[PDB]
Coordinates of C-alpha atoms and ligand atoms in Angstrom, one line a residue:
Chain K
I497 CA 60.7 -152.3 58.1
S498 CA 59.0 -153.0 54.7
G499 CA 58.3 -149.7 53.0
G500 CA 60.7 -147.7 55.3
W501 CA 64.2 -146.4 54.4
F502 CA 67.5 -147.8 55.7
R503 CA 69.3 -144.5 56.2
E504 CA 73.1 -144.3 56.6
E505 CA 74.3 -141.3 58.5
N506 CA 77.4 -140.9 60.7
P507 CA 77.9 -134.7 58.6
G508 CA 74.6 -133.4 57.2
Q509 CA 74.4 -136.1 54.5
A510 CA 72.9 -139.5 54.4
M511 CA 72.5 -142.1 51.7
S512 CA 69.3 -144.1 51.9
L513 CA 67.9 -147.3 50.5
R514 CA 64.1 -148.3 50.5
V515 CA 63.3 -151.5 52.3
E516 CA 61.1 -154.3 51.0
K517 CA 61.8 -156.9 53.7
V518 CA 64.1 -157.1 56.8
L519 CA 65.8 -160.5 56.9
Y520 CA 68.1 -160.3 60.0
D521 CA 68.8 -157.6 62.5
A522 CA 70.7 -158.5 65.7
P523 CA 73.8 -158.0 67.9
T524 CA 76.7 -160.3 67.2
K525 CA 79.6 -160.7 69.7
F526 CA 81.1 -157.5 68.2
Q527 CA 78.8 -155.5 65.9
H528 CA 75.2 -154.8 65.0
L529 CA 74.5 -156.7 61.8
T530 CA 71.5 -156.0 59.5
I531 CA 70.5 -157.6 56.4
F532 CA 67.4 -156.5 54.3
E533 CA 66.0 -156.9 50.7
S534 CA 65.6 -153.4 49.2
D535 CA 62.7 -152.2 47.1
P536 CA 62.4 -154.5 44.0
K537 CA 61.5 -151.5 41.8
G538 CA 65.2 -150.5 42.3
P539 CA 68.2 -152.5 41.3
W540 CA 69.9 -152.9 44.7
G541 CA 68.7 -156.4 45.9
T542 CA 69.9 -157.6 49.3
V543 CA 71.8 -155.3 51.5
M544 CA 74.2 -155.9 54.5
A545 CA 75.1 -153.3 57.0
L546 CA 77.4 -153.3 60.1
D547 CA 76.9 -150.7 62.9
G548 CA 74.8 -148.7 60.5
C549 CA 77.4 -148.6 57.6
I550 CA 76.5 -150.3 54.4
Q551 CA 78.9 -153.2 53.6
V552 CA 77.7 -155.0 50.6
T553 CA 74.7 -154.9 48.1
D554 CA 73.8 -157.4 45.4
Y555 CA 73.9 -154.9 42.6
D556 CA 77.3 -153.2 43.3
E557 CA 79.3 -155.7 45.4
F558 CA 81.5 -156.8 42.5
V559 CA 83.3 -153.4 42.3
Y560 CA 85.1 -153.4 45.5
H561 CA 85.7 -157.1 45.6
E562 CA 87.1 -157.2 42.0
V563 CA 89.3 -154.0 42.6
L564 CA 90.8 -155.4 45.8
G565 CA 91.3 -158.9 44.5
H566 CA 92.6 -158.2 41.1
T567 CA 94.5 -155.0 41.5
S568 CA 96.6 -156.7 44.1
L569 CA 97.1 -160.1 42.5
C570 CA 97.6 -158.7 39.0
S571 CA 100.4 -156.6 40.5
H572 CA 102.2 -159.7 41.9
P573 CA 104.5 -161.9 39.8
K574 CA 103.1 -165.2 41.1
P575 CA 100.7 -164.9 44.1
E576 CA 100.5 -168.3 45.7
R577 CA 99.8 -167.5 49.4
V578 CA 97.3 -164.8 50.3
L579 CA 95.9 -163.4 53.6
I580 CA 92.6 -161.5 53.8
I581 CA 92.0 -159.7 57.1
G582 CA 88.3 -159.1 57.5
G583 CA 86.4 -160.0 54.4
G584 CA 84.0 -162.3 56.2
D585 CA 81.4 -161.9 53.5
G586 CA 83.7 -163.8 51.2
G587 CA 83.7 -161.4 48.2
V588 CA 87.4 -160.7 48.1
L589 CA 88.1 -164.4 48.6
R590 CA 85.9 -165.3 45.6
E591 CA 88.0 -162.9 43.4
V592 CA 91.4 -164.1 44.8
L593 CA 90.4 -167.7 44.2
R594 CA 89.8 -167.0 40.5
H595 CA 93.6 -166.9 40.1
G596 CA 95.2 -170.1 39.0
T597 CA 98.4 -169.2 40.9
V598 CA 96.8 -169.3 44.3
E599 CA 97.6 -172.3 46.4
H600 CA 96.3 -171.1 49.8
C601 CA 94.4 -168.2 51.2
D602 CA 93.9 -167.6 54.9
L603 CA 90.9 -165.3 55.8
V604 CA 90.6 -164.0 59.4
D605 CA 87.5 -162.0 60.4
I606 CA 86.7 -161.1 64.0
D607 CA 83.0 -161.7 63.5
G608 CA 82.0 -165.3 62.8
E609 CA 78.4 -164.1 62.4
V610 CA 79.3 -162.2 59.2
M611 CA 80.4 -165.4 57.5
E612 CA 77.2 -167.2 58.7
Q613 CA 74.9 -164.5 57.5
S614 CA 76.7 -164.1 54.2
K615 CA 76.3 -167.9 53.6
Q616 CA 72.5 -167.5 54.4
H617 CA 71.7 -164.3 52.4
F618 CA 74.5 -163.7 49.9
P619 CA 75.2 -167.0 48.2
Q620 CA 77.0 -165.4 45.3
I621 CA 79.3 -163.4 47.6
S622 CA 80.0 -166.3 50.0
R623 CA 80.4 -169.3 47.7
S624 CA 84.2 -169.1 48.2
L625 CA 84.2 -169.6 51.9
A626 CA 83.9 -173.4 51.6
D627 CA 86.8 -173.8 49.1
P628 CA 89.6 -176.1 50.4
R629 CA 92.2 -173.6 49.2
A630 CA 90.9 -171.3 52.0
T631 CA 91.3 -171.6 55.7
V632 CA 88.6 -169.4 57.3
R633 CA 89.2 -168.4 60.9
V634 CA 87.3 -166.3 63.5
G635 CA 89.6 -163.9 65.2
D636 CA 91.2 -160.5 65.5
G637 CA 93.4 -159.7 62.6
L638 CA 95.9 -157.8 64.7
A639 CA 96.5 -160.9 66.9
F640 CA 96.6 -163.1 63.8
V641 CA 99.4 -161.2 62.1
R642 CA 101.3 -161.0 65.5
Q643 CA 101.3 -164.9 65.5
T644 CA 102.2 -165.2 61.8
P645 CA 105.8 -166.0 60.6
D646 CA 108.0 -163.5 58.6
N647 CA 107.7 -164.0 54.8
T648 CA 104.4 -165.9 54.9
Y649 CA 102.4 -164.2 52.2
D650 CA 102.7 -162.9 48.6
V651 CA 99.6 -160.7 49.1
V652 CA 97.9 -159.3 52.2
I653 CA 94.3 -157.7 51.6
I654 CA 92.9 -155.7 54.6
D655 CA 89.1 -155.7 53.9
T656 CA 87.9 -154.1 57.1
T657 CA 85.2 -151.8 58.6
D658 CA 86.1 -148.2 59.3
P659 CA 88.5 -146.9 61.9
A660 CA 85.9 -146.1 64.5
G661 CA 84.8 -149.7 65.6
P662 CA 86.6 -153.1 66.0
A663 CA 88.9 -152.4 63.0
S664 CA 90.5 -149.3 64.7
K665 CA 94.0 -150.7 65.1
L666 CA 94.1 -152.1 61.6
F667 CA 94.5 -148.5 60.4
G668 CA 97.6 -147.9 62.5
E669 CA 101.4 -148.0 61.9
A670 CA 102.1 -150.9 64.5
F671 CA 99.7 -153.2 62.4
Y672 CA 101.3 -152.1 59.2
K673 CA 104.8 -152.9 60.5
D674 CA 103.6 -156.4 61.0
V675 CA 102.0 -156.6 57.5
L676 CA 105.4 -155.6 56.1
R677 CA 107.0 -158.4 58.1
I678 CA 104.7 -161.2 57.1
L679 CA 105.0 -160.3 53.4
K680 CA 107.6 -162.1 51.3
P681 CA 110.2 -159.8 49.5
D682 CA 108.0 -159.3 46.5
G683 CA 104.8 -158.9 48.5
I684 CA 101.8 -156.6 47.8
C685 CA 99.3 -155.2 50.5
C686 CA 96.1 -153.4 49.8
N687 CA 93.3 -152.2 52.1
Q688 CA 89.9 -150.7 52.5
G689 CA 91.4 -147.3 51.9
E690 CA 88.4 -145.0 52.6
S691 CA 87.2 -141.8 50.7
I692 CA 89.1 -138.9 49.1
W693 CA 86.0 -136.7 49.8
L694 CA 85.5 -137.7 53.5
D695 CA 88.9 -139.1 54.7
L696 CA 91.6 -137.3 52.7
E697 CA 93.6 -136.4 55.9
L698 CA 93.6 -140.1 57.0
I699 CA 94.7 -141.3 53.5
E700 CA 97.6 -138.8 53.5
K701 CA 98.6 -140.0 57.1
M702 CA 98.5 -143.7 56.2
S703 CA 100.2 -143.3 52.8
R704 CA 103.1 -141.6 54.6
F705 CA 103.4 -144.0 57.5
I706 CA 103.1 -147.0 55.3
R707 CA 106.0 -145.7 53.2
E708 CA 108.0 -144.8 56.2
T709 CA 107.4 -148.2 57.9
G710 CA 109.4 -149.8 55.0
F711 CA 107.1 -150.3 52.0
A712 CA 108.9 -149.2 48.8
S713 CA 105.7 -147.6 47.2
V714 CA 102.1 -146.9 48.0
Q715 CA 99.5 -145.7 45.5
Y716 CA 95.7 -145.2 46.0
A717 CA 93.3 -146.8 43.6
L718 CA 89.9 -145.0 43.3
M719 CA 86.8 -146.9 42.4
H720 CA 83.0 -146.2 41.8
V721 CA 80.7 -147.7 44.5
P722 CA 77.3 -146.1 44.6
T723 CA 76.4 -147.4 48.1
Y724 CA 79.5 -146.3 49.9
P725 CA 79.6 -142.8 51.4
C726 CA 79.9 -140.1 48.6
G727 CA 79.9 -142.8 45.8
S728 CA 83.4 -144.0 45.9
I729 CA 86.1 -145.6 48.0
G730 CA 89.8 -146.5 47.4
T731 CA 92.5 -148.9 48.3
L732 CA 96.2 -148.2 49.1
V733 CA 98.1 -150.6 47.0
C734 CA 101.6 -151.1 48.5
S735 CA 104.7 -152.9 47.3
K736 CA 107.4 -154.3 49.6
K737 CA 109.9 -154.4 46.7
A738 CA 111.4 -151.2 45.2
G739 CA 111.1 -150.6 41.4
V740 CA 107.5 -152.0 41.2
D741 CA 104.9 -149.8 39.5
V742 CA 101.6 -151.2 40.7
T743 CA 99.7 -148.6 38.5
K744 CA 100.3 -150.7 35.3
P745 CA 99.2 -154.3 35.6
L746 CA 102.2 -156.6 35.8
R747 CA 100.1 -159.7 34.9
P748 CA 97.1 -158.4 32.9
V749 CA 93.9 -160.2 33.7
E750 CA 93.0 -160.4 30.0
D751 CA 95.5 -163.2 29.7
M752 CA 93.5 -165.1 32.4
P753 CA 90.6 -167.5 31.7
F754 CA 88.1 -165.6 33.9
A755 CA 88.7 -162.1 32.5
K756 CA 85.4 -162.1 30.7
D757 CA 83.3 -163.0 33.8
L758 CA 84.3 -159.8 35.6
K759 CA 81.8 -157.0 35.8
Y760 CA 84.1 -154.0 36.7
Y761 CA 87.7 -154.7 36.6
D762 CA 90.1 -155.0 33.6
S763 CA 93.4 -153.5 32.7
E764 CA 92.1 -150.2 31.4
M765 CA 90.2 -149.8 34.6
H766 CA 93.3 -150.8 36.7
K767 CA 95.4 -148.1 35.1
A768 CA 92.5 -145.6 35.3
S769 CA 92.0 -146.1 39.1
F770 CA 95.3 -144.5 39.9
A771 CA 94.4 -141.2 38.2
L772 CA 93.1 -139.0 41.0
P773 CA 91.3 -135.7 41.0
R774 CA 93.8 -132.8 41.2
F775 CA 92.8 -132.0 44.8
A776 CA 93.9 -135.6 45.8
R777 CA 96.6 -136.3 43.2
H778 CA 99.5 -135.6 45.7
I779 CA 98.6 -139.0 47.3
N780 CA 100.0 -140.7 44.3
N781 CA 102.6 -137.9 43.5
Chain T
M288 CA 56.8 -134.9 39.7
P289 CA 58.7 -133.3 42.6
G290 CA 58.7 -129.9 44.4
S291 CA 58.5 -128.6 48.0
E292 CA 57.5 -131.8 49.7
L293 CA 61.1 -133.2 49.4
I294 CA 62.0 -130.8 52.3
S295 CA 60.6 -132.8 55.2
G296 CA 61.8 -132.9 58.8
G297 CA 65.1 -131.1 58.5
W298 CA 66.3 -132.7 55.3
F299 CA 66.1 -132.5 51.5
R300 CA 65.7 -136.0 50.3
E301 CA 66.4 -136.7 46.7
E302 CA 63.5 -139.1 46.0
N303 CA 62.6 -139.5 42.2
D304 CA 61.1 -142.2 40.1
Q305 CA 64.1 -141.8 37.7
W306 CA 66.1 -143.6 40.4
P307 CA 63.7 -145.9 42.4
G308 CA 64.6 -147.5 45.7
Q309 CA 67.2 -144.8 46.7
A310 CA 67.6 -141.3 47.8
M311 CA 70.6 -139.1 48.7
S312 CA 69.7 -136.7 51.5
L313 CA 71.2 -133.5 52.6
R314 CA 70.1 -131.7 55.7
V315 CA 68.6 -128.2 55.4
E316 CA 69.8 -125.2 57.5
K317 CA 67.6 -122.7 55.7
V318 CA 65.4 -122.7 52.6
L319 CA 66.5 -119.7 50.4
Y320 CA 64.2 -120.3 47.4
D321 CA 61.4 -122.6 46.8
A322 CA 58.9 -121.8 44.0
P323 CA 57.6 -122.8 40.6
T324 CA 59.3 -120.8 37.8
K325 CA 57.8 -120.6 34.2
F326 CA 59.2 -124.0 33.5
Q327 CA 60.4 -125.9 36.6
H328 CA 60.3 -126.2 40.4
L329 CA 63.3 -124.4 41.7
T330 CA 64.6 -125.1 45.3
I331 CA 67.7 -123.5 46.8
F332 CA 68.8 -124.2 50.4
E333 CA 71.7 -123.8 52.8
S334 CA 72.7 -127.3 53.9
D335 CA 74.1 -128.1 57.4
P336 CA 77.0 -125.6 58.3
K337 CA 78.5 -128.4 60.3
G338 CA 78.9 -130.2 56.9
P339 CA 80.9 -129.2 53.8
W340 CA 78.1 -129.0 51.2
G341 CA 77.2 -125.4 51.4
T342 CA 74.4 -124.1 49.3
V343 CA 72.4 -126.6 47.2
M344 CA 70.2 -126.1 44.1
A345 CA 67.6 -128.5 42.8
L346 CA 65.3 -128.4 39.8
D347 CA 62.1 -130.6 39.7
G348 CA 63.6 -132.2 42.9
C349 CA 66.9 -133.1 41.1
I350 CA 70.1 -131.8 42.7
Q351 CA 71.9 -129.5 40.2
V352 CA 74.8 -128.0 42.0
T353 CA 76.3 -127.8 45.5
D354 CA 79.1 -125.4 46.5
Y355 CA 81.4 -128.1 47.5
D356 CA 81.5 -130.4 44.4
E357 CA 80.3 -128.2 41.5
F358 CA 83.8 -127.9 40.2
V359 CA 83.9 -131.5 39.1
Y360 CA 81.1 -131.5 36.4
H361 CA 81.9 -128.0 35.3
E362 CA 85.6 -128.7 34.8
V363 CA 85.0 -132.0 33.0
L364 CA 82.4 -130.6 30.6
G365 CA 84.4 -127.5 29.9
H366 CA 87.9 -128.8 29.6
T367 CA 87.4 -132.3 28.1
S368 CA 85.5 -130.7 25.2
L369 CA 87.8 -127.7 24.6
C370 CA 91.0 -129.7 25.2
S371 CA 89.8 -132.0 22.4
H372 CA 89.4 -129.2 19.9
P373 CA 92.4 -127.8 17.8
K374 CA 91.4 -124.1 18.4
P375 CA 88.0 -123.5 20.0
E376 CA 87.0 -119.9 19.3
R377 CA 83.3 -120.0 19.3
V378 CA 81.4 -122.0 21.9
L379 CA 77.7 -122.6 22.5
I380 CA 76.3 -123.7 25.9
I381 CA 72.7 -125.0 25.9
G382 CA 71.3 -124.9 29.4
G383 CA 74.1 -124.1 32.0
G384 CA 72.2 -121.2 33.5
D385 CA 74.1 -121.5 36.7
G386 CA 77.2 -120.3 34.7
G387 CA 79.6 -123.1 35.9
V388 CA 80.5 -124.5 32.5
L389 CA 80.8 -120.9 31.1
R390 CA 83.3 -120.1 33.9
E391 CA 85.4 -123.0 32.8
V392 CA 85.1 -122.4 29.0
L393 CA 86.2 -118.8 29.6
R394 CA 89.5 -119.9 31.2
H395 CA 90.6 -120.7 27.6
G396 CA 92.5 -117.9 25.9
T397 CA 91.4 -119.3 22.5
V398 CA 87.7 -118.5 23.2
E399 CA 86.6 -115.3 21.3
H400 CA 82.9 -115.7 22.3
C401 CA 80.6 -118.1 24.1
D402 CA 76.8 -118.0 23.7
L403 CA 74.7 -119.5 26.6
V404 CA 71.0 -120.3 26.1
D405 CA 68.9 -121.6 29.1
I406 CA 65.1 -121.9 29.1
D407 CA 64.7 -120.7 32.7
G408 CA 65.7 -117.2 33.4
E409 CA 65.0 -117.7 37.1
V410 CA 67.9 -120.2 37.3
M411 CA 70.4 -117.4 36.1
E412 CA 68.8 -114.8 38.5
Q413 CA 69.0 -117.2 41.5
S414 CA 72.5 -118.3 40.6
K415 CA 73.7 -114.7 40.6
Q416 CA 72.0 -114.2 44.1
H417 CA 73.0 -117.5 45.7
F418 CA 76.0 -119.0 43.8
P419 CA 78.3 -116.2 43.1
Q420 CA 81.4 -118.4 42.7
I421 CA 79.5 -120.4 40.0
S422 CA 77.8 -117.5 38.2
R423 CA 80.8 -115.1 38.2
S424 CA 81.2 -115.3 34.4
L425 CA 77.5 -114.8 33.3
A426 CA 78.2 -111.1 32.7
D427 CA 81.6 -111.5 31.0
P428 CA 81.9 -109.5 27.7
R429 CA 83.0 -112.8 25.9
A430 CA 79.6 -114.3 26.8
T431 CA 76.1 -113.6 25.5
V432 CA 73.4 -115.1 27.7
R433 CA 69.9 -115.5 26.3
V434 CA 66.7 -116.9 27.8
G435 CA 65.0 -119.5 25.6
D436 CA 64.6 -123.1 24.5
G437 CA 67.8 -124.6 23.1
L438 CA 65.9 -126.6 20.7
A439 CA 64.7 -123.4 19.0
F440 CA 68.0 -121.7 19.2
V441 CA 69.9 -124.5 17.4
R442 CA 67.2 -124.7 14.7
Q443 CA 67.7 -120.9 14.1
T444 CA 71.5 -121.0 14.1
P445 CA 73.2 -121.2 10.8
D446 CA 75.3 -124.0 9.6
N447 CA 79.0 -124.0 10.6
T448 CA 78.8 -121.5 13.5
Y449 CA 80.4 -123.2 16.5
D450 CA 83.6 -125.0 17.3
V451 CA 82.2 -126.6 20.5
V452 CA 78.5 -127.1 21.7
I453 CA 78.1 -128.1 25.4
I454 CA 74.6 -129.4 26.3
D455 CA 74.4 -128.9 30.0
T456 CA 70.8 -129.9 30.7
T457 CA 68.5 -131.3 33.3
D458 CA 67.3 -134.9 33.0
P459 CA 64.9 -136.1 30.1
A460 CA 61.6 -135.8 32.1
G461 CA 61.0 -132.0 32.1
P462 CA 61.8 -129.1 29.7
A463 CA 65.0 -130.8 28.6
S464 CA 63.0 -133.8 27.1
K465 CA 63.6 -133.1 23.3
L466 CA 67.3 -132.2 24.0
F467 CA 67.8 -136.0 24.5
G468 CA 66.4 -136.6 21.0
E469 CA 67.7 -137.3 17.5
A470 CA 66.1 -134.2 15.9
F471 CA 68.0 -131.9 18.2
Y472 CA 71.4 -133.7 17.7
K473 CA 70.8 -133.2 13.9
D474 CA 70.9 -129.6 14.4
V475 CA 73.8 -129.7 16.7
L476 CA 75.8 -131.6 14.0
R477 CA 74.7 -129.0 11.4
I478 CA 75.7 -125.9 13.5
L479 CA 79.1 -127.3 14.3
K480 CA 82.0 -126.4 12.0
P481 CA 83.7 -129.4 10.3
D482 CA 86.1 -130.0 13.1
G483 CA 83.4 -129.4 15.8
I484 CA 83.1 -131.2 19.2
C485 CA 80.0 -131.5 21.3
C486 CA 79.4 -132.9 24.7
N487 CA 76.4 -133.3 27.0
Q488 CA 74.9 -134.2 30.4
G489 CA 75.2 -137.9 29.6
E490 CA 73.5 -139.4 32.7
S491 CA 74.5 -142.4 34.9
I492 CA 75.9 -145.8 33.9
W493 CA 74.2 -147.4 37.0
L494 CA 70.7 -145.9 36.3
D495 CA 70.5 -144.9 32.6
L496 CA 72.7 -147.3 30.7
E497 CA 69.9 -148.0 28.2
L498 CA 69.4 -144.3 27.5
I499 CA 73.2 -143.8 27.1
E500 CA 73.3 -146.6 24.6
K501 CA 70.4 -145.1 22.7
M502 CA 71.9 -141.7 22.5
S503 CA 75.3 -143.0 21.5
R504 CA 73.8 -144.9 18.6
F505 CA 71.6 -142.1 17.2
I506 CA 74.4 -139.5 17.6
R507 CA 76.6 -141.7 15.4
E508 CA 73.7 -142.2 13.1
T509 CA 73.0 -138.4 12.7
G510 CA 76.6 -138.2 11.3
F511 CA 79.0 -137.7 14.2
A512 CA 82.2 -139.7 13.5
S513 CA 82.8 -140.7 17.1
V514 CA 81.0 -140.7 20.5
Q515 CA 82.7 -141.6 23.7
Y516 CA 81.4 -141.4 27.3
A517 CA 83.5 -139.9 30.0
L518 CA 82.7 -140.9 33.6
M519 CA 83.3 -138.6 36.6
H520 CA 83.0 -138.6 40.4
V521 CA 80.2 -136.3 41.7
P522 CA 79.1 -137.2 45.2
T523 CA 75.8 -135.4 45.0
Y524 CA 74.6 -136.7 41.8
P525 CA 72.5 -140.0 41.8
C526 CA 74.8 -143.0 42.6
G527 CA 77.8 -140.6 43.0
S528 CA 78.7 -140.2 39.3
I529 CA 77.6 -138.9 36.0
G530 CA 79.0 -138.8 32.5
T531 CA 79.2 -136.9 29.3
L532 CA 79.1 -138.1 25.8
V533 CA 82.0 -136.4 23.9
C534 CA 81.3 -136.4 20.2
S535 CA 83.4 -135.5 17.2
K536 CA 81.9 -134.2 13.9
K537 CA 85.1 -135.2 12.1
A538 CA 86.6 -138.6 11.7
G539 CA 90.1 -139.4 13.0
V540 CA 89.6 -137.6 16.2
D541 CA 90.5 -139.4 19.5
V542 CA 88.7 -137.3 22.0
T543 CA 89.9 -139.7 24.8
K544 CA 93.5 -138.5 24.6
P545 CA 93.8 -134.7 25.0
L546 CA 94.6 -132.9 21.7
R547 CA 95.8 -129.7 23.5
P548 CA 96.8 -130.8 27.0
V549 CA 95.7 -128.4 29.7
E550 CA 99.1 -128.6 31.3
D551 CA 100.5 -126.3 28.6
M552 CA 97.9 -123.7 29.6
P553 CA 98.3 -121.1 32.2
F554 CA 95.2 -122.0 34.2
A555 CA 95.9 -125.8 34.7
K556 CA 97.0 -125.2 38.3
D557 CA 93.7 -123.4 39.1
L558 CA 91.7 -126.5 38.5
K559 CA 90.4 -128.7 41.4
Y560 CA 89.6 -132.0 39.5
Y561 CA 90.6 -132.0 35.9
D562 CA 93.9 -132.7 34.3
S563 CA 95.2 -134.8 31.4
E564 CA 95.6 -138.0 33.4
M565 CA 92.0 -137.6 34.7
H566 CA 90.8 -136.9 31.1
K567 CA 92.3 -140.1 29.8
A568 CA 91.1 -142.1 32.8
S569 CA 87.5 -140.8 32.5
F570 CA 86.9 -142.9 29.3
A571 CA 87.8 -146.1 31.0
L572 CA 84.5 -147.7 32.0
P573 CA 83.6 -150.6 34.2
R574 CA 83.5 -153.8 32.1
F575 CA 79.7 -153.9 32.3
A576 CA 79.5 -150.5 30.6
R577 CA 82.5 -150.7 28.3
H578 CA 80.4 -151.5 25.2
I579 CA 79.3 -147.8 25.2
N580 CA 82.9 -146.9 24.2
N581 CA 84.0 -150.1 22.4
Ligands
S4M1772 C1 82.1 -157.0 55.8 S1 83.8 -156.7 55.3 C2 83.4 -155.1 54.3 C3 82.5 -155.3 53.2 C4 83.1 -155.5 51.9 N1 83.7 -156.9 51.8 C5 84.6 -155.8 56.8 C6 84.8 -156.9 57.8 O1 85.8 -156.4 58.7 C7 85.8 -157.2 59.9 N2 86.6 -156.7 61.0 C8 86.4 -155.5 61.7 N3 87.4 -155.5 62.6 C9 88.2 -156.6 62.5 C10 89.4 -157.0 63.1 N4 90.0 -156.3 64.2 N5 89.9 -158.2 62.7 C11 89.4 -158.8 61.7 N6 88.3 -158.4 61.0 C12 87.7 -157.3 61.5 C13 84.2 -157.1 60.1 O2 83.9 -158.1 61.1 C14 83.6 -157.3 58.8 O3 83.0 -158.5 58.5
S4M1773 C1 71.1 -126.2 36.1 S1 72.0 -126.8 34.6 C2 72.8 -128.3 35.2 C3 73.6 -128.3 36.5 C4 75.1 -128.3 36.3 N1 75.4 -127.0 35.6 C5 70.6 -127.5 33.7 C6 69.9 -126.4 32.9 O1 69.2 -127.0 31.9 C7 68.2 -126.0 31.5 N2 67.3 -126.5 30.5 C8 66.3 -127.4 30.6 N3 65.7 -127.6 29.5 C9 66.2 -126.7 28.6 C10 65.9 -126.3 27.3 N4 64.8 -127.0 26.6 N5 66.6 -125.4 26.7 C11 67.6 -124.7 27.4 N6 67.9 -125.0 28.7 C12 67.2 -126.0 29.2 C13 67.6 -125.7 32.9 O2 66.7 -124.5 33.0 C14 68.8 -125.7 33.8 O3 69.2 -124.4 34.3

């Protein structure tokens, strides 16, 4: 409520944001969705949470959306067809659609209410959802990839909630076999790759099963997000083709017309993301 | 501003008007220390043993160290600076009474002596009592630890005394206030030898960007040839990161690329965060902050 504290806890730590006004707080068909304006004496703006876990804020949203969208597309030689699983807020889709190469993007999120509330309360995040290059569907991403042809996509971006709720299977090897299949030979996959502080064991598990399922290479890109647990998150950037080094940008964004509208990502930051703290560096070898 | 009332209903809550609208919280298993010293409010507590954080120290309600992530800031301060220097033999730490940066500095076989001057002797005594893995080098024969204001210490120190000066302070509100000022950086530039390096506690790009820009400008104006900010990942600092301004007295020095890589040192494998790839990556800043570095 106004003057209280949205508190995110799931051990012995919580990140909290002061509330100015609650805009929406209700059950969807799948999740508990909350949207509030945080204290205007702070920089956060409007905040969206799902099942108690912060998803986007006005002040820092650009980080994760730019890192997912551009690290993957600038690693691809000519990304024309893209799939986003999850991503119902539209942020990754806004970034992907900056690229002049993209002809079509399909976005599939299980919760149609996330798209609706993002259109109502996060116009700068959701502008993309109406673009005629995108087909936006309500549905489970695991079912979607199981109905999708081999060799459909240049890039697949898995922008999901954590393993504990409706995204559970999207962190498993069966799903990843299907993502490898629906990618074209030169395809790239990236995901919501979780934390090196909280989820190191899961990142090592997934990096190994993704490689073993048939991806030629898998590297974790670390990013700074103040409102995600412990202040960061990462993405596993995976290449179907051997001999690809996703840690150096193949097509640097500085050669693109929208490079100077980005707030976080550029080529120095792309290369820097793959340097990991010594305790974690074995992820990237 | 803050003291004992941040410990409320089972938790320490990092509420501060230096970061409005937010607060990191850690749960409290047992308060170990909570009292005003001669200069600051010192709080030490054991966090939830079900969590990883261990013991936690705060000053004037600002989290300073936890057991679990202290290695990050101490390794980055200590090794980014020394690894940027051709032969760092004489080092000064202003602040740093927990000993963490000193522990890292003393890994270096080049160091003949390090002086440490912290205003608050209570911080050193409680670090020895409650953070032994952090404070393990305070009594080293290669260190001299003194209790006093760093502003006075630097003004008394002769020209051309130190190869590296590390300014490991609390925030600008309390006793560290003048350590974020031009007058003080004048003295640091003077006490450095010609090929000196300094670095500091350079605050947050998400909360203090305007302060970082101001320090960067006046450090260059005092006469330092180059100033670059290195960003690092610290979960228990506000917004989950902090930085350091790494400054070269001499021109032609690229502090962003290690001069003496740590990998050619026998203790490289002992570090938990820092290495040369992390050193080079730390100077890459989000586009909105990149003007701090050029
Ligand atoms: C909000 S987005 C994360 C915020 C940063 N863009 C995570 C989305 O993942 C969706 N999600 C969770 N599970 C699934 C499945 N199984 N399929 C598709 N999308 C899903 C969920 O409905 C969110 O809108
Ligand atoms: C705890 S240390 C930072 C935590 C990571 N090592 C910050 C130290 O700055 C000291 N400090 C603050 N002001 C000054 C002055 N003016 N002089 C010296 N040391 C100072 C203060 O007593 C802390 O122990």
